[PDB]
């Protein structure tokens, strides 16, 4: 006929699609990882070549981690020093910061602050980034203003343009299927959540050995 | 035998389920969209015909957008004026508001406020909705109370019944697979995240041309 | 040849993988549930046998619910009394509490508080757990300190070790595919979101009848 399969065979194939996925649902996980790998490739320039995205470490770094993070995210605050320590112990490693507004208004405001500072004065970014991360309270307008005053960045205006960069980060995180912070792109892998320094150190080395 | 497929063929089919999804994981995306389309159809009356859900624009509107949103969500605040502007420029378009408690306690409180106002005095809803959206701070009990005082709605009690409407919105968002705000139902599409006015304007027109 | 399927049959099978999942996307839901069931089994000891995780009810309980929850989550606050009431009406039912830091810094701080109290003085945990849940405001350092003072637990230090327990809860929630609170493990089911007492009462009975 016009079909290579018999109708009875077609019916069994359809049943086998269900049975295979229900009995071996790990296939779905593998498929999602494959979808993530393709997303990393398609969004590569947004990840690594966005001039508006702050960078910690050498511009000439041979490995670049991409940190999707939130200044109001508790394990982001605790993980960020570990990311920065990698750049200190491994000069060939840099970290790109992708602030996200996940935890609400103050997160967006904080992100707007660091992104505006980065554009106006890149060298001044790190101090504010760190001050916001080490803050032990949920951020608000007053505390963010204090952070900028305390890092000598209070002269720098928060721009509407920086909110577009922030929106790009948000769109990027969605395209990569990231729905939690901290999320860290390391080579072909997206690390979900914080990890201790030794594990991070191992993972970056495994990726350093691939260059 | 009792099988249209040979055992060897069955084995290859199972392998092909995996290989097909891993090599072409876009199939999963298409399947999720199909699942979303079915969800929109099954939850149609909860979406469009819930009297307890506030509406912006004409009751006789031929196109109705459903805005899943959060008063503590930064890009919700910035996107909402665009949704309202559509109803001003396109009188045949209305917007149904589905407040969500995603960003925590104050979000629920704020939602409770607008939903309670809608039930007691529908015409009084819009002012409070707008005041809460334009608020530049993470909401709290005091700021929500100020919003109600500033919109002459402070006489209206927050009801436990409005918390049921809010719970319905939450359950609805889950059934639709919405895990982020703002999410906007436009015809057969669920728009993820905010978009600029011109893009929104194009999308609504494409849907207006289908009526 | 080396293939049980003809090439034309292979092509049709690949097409049928797509068509089956797009026409019957409920298969994906069933597959995810299967993946959840396997996750519950593999993470069983983290769920039920973590000494660092607070328990409400009898240690010798024959049914144990696992409550993934957040002190800044509005419907968590309203659902928790229902979970505790089950343990009062059904002494053979206990509830394990898994605090999560989803809503930000104060959530982590609050979780750190209850987990630190549990380890130092288990009997003192419940009062603080309840006080934090009944709090009508988004928590902050001051309000958390007040909660501890008001429950005679302010002598107990927040430990860095409790932050590891909290991180375990977070990792556990991810492995189980939980991306919202309250999430309640009941036997082989993961209940998403809050439910009224009568429905909860029915579900626990259905699981009680399986022991």
Author numbering:
A (entry chain A), B (entry chain A), C (entry chain A): 1 to 38, 50 to 222
From the article:
Like DsbC, PmScsC is a protein disulfide isomerase with a thioredoxin-fold catalytic domain, redox-active cysteines and a redox-partner membrane protein (PmScsB) that reduces the active-site cysteines. Unlike DsbC, PmScsC is trimeric rather than dimeric. The native PmScsC protomer consists of an N-terminal trimerization stem with an 11-amino-acid flexible linker connected to a C-terminal thioredoxin-fold catalytic domain harbouring a CXXC active site. The region responsible for this conformational flexibility is an 11-amino-acid linker within the trimerization stem of the protein.
PmScsCΔLinker is newly reported here and lacks the 11 amino acids that form the flexible linker. We show that the PmScsCΔLinker variant lacks both disulfide isomerase and dithiol oxidase activities. ­The crystal structure reveals a trimeric arrangement for PmScsCΔLinker, with the catalytic domains closely packed against each other. The regions on either side of the linker region reported to be helical in the three native PmScsC crystal structures are directly connected in PmScsCΔLinker and are also helical. The trimerization stem interactions of PmScsCΔLinker are similar to those observed in the crystal structures of the native enzyme, but all three catalytic motifs are in closer proximity to each other than in any of the native PmScsC crystal structures. Indeed, the crystal structure of PmScsCΔLinker reveals a close association of a positively charged patch near the catalytic motif on the accessible surface of one protomer with a neutral/hydrophobic patch on another. However, it should be noted that PmScsCΔLinker has an additional unanticipated mutation (Asn6Lys) at the N-terminus. In the PmScsCΔLinker crystal structure the side chain of Gln9 adopts the same conformation as in all three native PmScsC structures, but the mutated residue Lys6 does not form an equivalent hydrogen bond to the main chain of Gln9. Removal of the 11-amino-acid flexible linker from PmScsC impacts on the activity of the protein: unlike the native protein, PmScsCΔLinker has no disulfide isomerase activity.
